[PDB]
Subunit: 202 residues, 4 copies
Amino acid sequence: MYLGRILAVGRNSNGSFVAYRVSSRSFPNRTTSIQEERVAVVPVEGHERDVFRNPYIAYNCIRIVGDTAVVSNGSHTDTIADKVALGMNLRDAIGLSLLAMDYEKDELNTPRIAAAINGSEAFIGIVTADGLMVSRVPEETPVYISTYEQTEPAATEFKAGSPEEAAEFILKGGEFAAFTHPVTAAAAFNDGEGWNLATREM
Amino acid sequence: MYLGRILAVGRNSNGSFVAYRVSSRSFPNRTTSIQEERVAVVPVEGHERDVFRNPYIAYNCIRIVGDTAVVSNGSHTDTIADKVALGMNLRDAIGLSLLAMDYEKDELNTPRIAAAINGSEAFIGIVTADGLMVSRVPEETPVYISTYEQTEPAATEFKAGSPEEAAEFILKGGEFAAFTHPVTAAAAFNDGEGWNLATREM
Amino acid sequence: MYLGRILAVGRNSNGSFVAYRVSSRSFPNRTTSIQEERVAVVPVEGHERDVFRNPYIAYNCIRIVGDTAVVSNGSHTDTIADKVALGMNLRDAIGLSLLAMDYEKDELNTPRIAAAINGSEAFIGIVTADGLMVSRVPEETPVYISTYEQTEPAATEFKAGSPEEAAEFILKGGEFAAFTHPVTAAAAFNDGEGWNLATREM
Amino acid sequence: MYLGRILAVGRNSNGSFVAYRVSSRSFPNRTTSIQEERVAVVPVEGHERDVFRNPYIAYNCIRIVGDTAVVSNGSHTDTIADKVALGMNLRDAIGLSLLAMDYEKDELNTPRIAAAINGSEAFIGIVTADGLMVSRVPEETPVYISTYEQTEPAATEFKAGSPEEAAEFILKGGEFAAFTHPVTAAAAFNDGEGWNLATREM
């Protein structure tokens, strides 16, 4: 039931979205700082030195580039977002980034997961010690994936009509309530009039 | 039951192998020409002009580079084999090649499939209009994948103790007997003393 | 003075263009067949079997994808063109393709060269046994590059106001008159109203 | 005369080496912390918060993976080093990483530069808004490159017979004495018996 970092992507009757959640046992001292077209996962007041021992705990988890929302559990959020801003299709932007960045070199070979959505398409991917998988997000249902256990996209009836609702849901809502060690979350939602960011602190 | 081109990869109690089979409705006039560390799929006597109308029917389906055997349904066999000969790990050699080459631009957006095996590892991959998937071949069982229907690796009790047996099997043996439109096949087998090539004409 | 295959790209007071020329000592029996948004280099009547001994002599040298013209000395013309049609920027479309395809495995490790131009940008690149170089085409002057000798982009006062003129020029015009073993040429020119193809037979 | 970050790579009569130097106007408050097969560029005591405003000032500038030394002006040091440890040749390890990571998104589109050397080969590369260039390091002379001005490899008579000498030299030695705003440096040297790390504080 410990999935580590989790992300969800898809469309509802209310709009499209991207949701991210940090689950952790070793670094509970982190929060999500919202900014202009970007949400970063950063250390809490006083724990800013934690990044020099573990370089995987600080990074942008959500980037908004034009009509596209990008989400991931690491610095590859920028790598992917930059390629989209430069013109690369989603499938390749995620594929190229994950292939090059690869899994994280920690005690668990923590996979790098990501997803991206624009007005008409969405892809989700993961890179592990055993492979690279980037796949189209089904038009029928939203999906989620995590660094541990659920290392394959899985369907989800994501309920939300705003970024704050989306963040809350991946944090405590529905099936995610069961996944342990919640730390913090973030999300981007597009009601059809643009992307809006929001966060939630357990 | 029409899977198009098929390939299988894995290890037996007799050794490791790579098997390839052409299934076709439109171009039954092709055969497999064996050569030095390479097996090509070529037009039969007199049909050599077929390659100028359909550039996807002629290509090397098997390349042997050192201790590694590479198999695929297209020219990416060389792209992958060359990267292995230059030093790239299997996962990345297949991933990079498929990501760059992409699915074939024919009436069916025919996927590009591939696999590679050396003395200790094996990977198999596919790239389609909907995604890119490269995955480790399980140590437990051999696997196969095709351009149509079986676009995900699937387990198989591959029986063979030589290249000619392997080629025969993917051509008519076991579960492959059911897959229609057999045209020609090829294979590479390593009994632990090196790679050996062979072909079979229905 | 033997540069092998040559390509030029850039803009004039008459428009933008892409020019390609085959220089050869071993296979003079080839011509350029023009088609819908594509120019192929193919064997002359009766020499169609030459492609089974040397797989680098047959390929599309020019592809037109929307507002972009792509040129190269090999099958990577399609690899690059496809990525542009799927959404990849020129710099990356050429970079990714050349990095993956790499230099040709013939007696000379013949480099793979390419270039692409759209309404506002143009890049040119080359991949050899010693490196990978993709660079922006200067707005000031057109440039050319070849497989042998001139393995770095070089400035050129390309004179042409149509595809047939462009093809002629890289074939016999200006500084190219000196480069030996002319076989055949092709070109694409955009007077600002779209791309037009043409060829020239010595 | 302000080249920004600089790196040098090559071989002497004393051995092979990799040298790195930080030149800066905006963040002089940084130092080089040496570790096990790795040299990081980190903020000085008390300036640890500087990394949350400018994510390009903290990173490993040198990684030692087996018989290979890797150097770069950013986090791509790890991206490249990891691919080498996984089996990728130097040319491609640098090419793939730079192509994917791309230039840094700061006020100056600061290029990402890198180099790598093993017992028999060495490559150096750079990726900018205008291109991607990865090239073999000449056997004849060592070379250097920087983020600003010298964005092309340039020859250098690098004098050093140890890591501390190498670090000193790129910091104040020879032609580098003229390049302004020295902050800190690091280097790896192989006298033929393995890689050794060292740093120098102006």
